[PDB]
């Protein structure tokens, strides 16, 4: 899971992901954490 800290950062993450490709670059570019865990930390849950 693509765990983002704010709703804005997740929406920005989804704009990064409009081409439908660079999930890891969407992480670095929007300060989100892609974690092997099936769900998101309390502080990274959008």
Swiss-Prot record:
- What's one GO-annotated cellular component? extracellular region
- Supply the PROSITE patterns for this chain: THIONIN
User: Does the record bear Metal-binding in its keywords?
Assistant: no
Location of this chain's protein in the cell: Secreted
BP terms from Gene Ontology = defense response
Q: Which residues cross the membrane?
A: none
Q: Report the principal subcellular site.
A: secreted
Query: Which keywords accompany this UniProt record?
Result: Disulfide bond, Plant defense, Secreted
Key word Transferase present in the record? no
Which residues form each disulfide bond in the chain?
A: 3-40, 4-32, 16-26
Record-linked Pfam families = Thionin (PF00321)
* Protein task: The function of this hydrophobic plant seed protein is not known.
Q: What else is known?
A: Two isoforms exists, a major form PL (shown here) and a minor form SI.
Q: Which family does it belong to?
A: Belongs to the plant thionin (TC 1.C.44) family.
Q: What name does UniProt use for this protein?
A: Crambin
Native organism = Crambe hispanica subsp. abyssinica (Abyssinian kale)
Upper lineage is: Eukaryota, Viridiplantae, Streptophyta, Embryophyta, Tracheophyta
């Amino acid at each position: 899971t693509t765990c983002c800290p704010s709703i804005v950062a997740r929406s920005n993450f989804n704009v990064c992901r409009l081409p439908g490709t660079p999930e890891a670059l969407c992480a670095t570019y929007t300060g989100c954490i892609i974690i092997p865990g099936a769900t998101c930390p309390g502080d990274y849950a959008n």
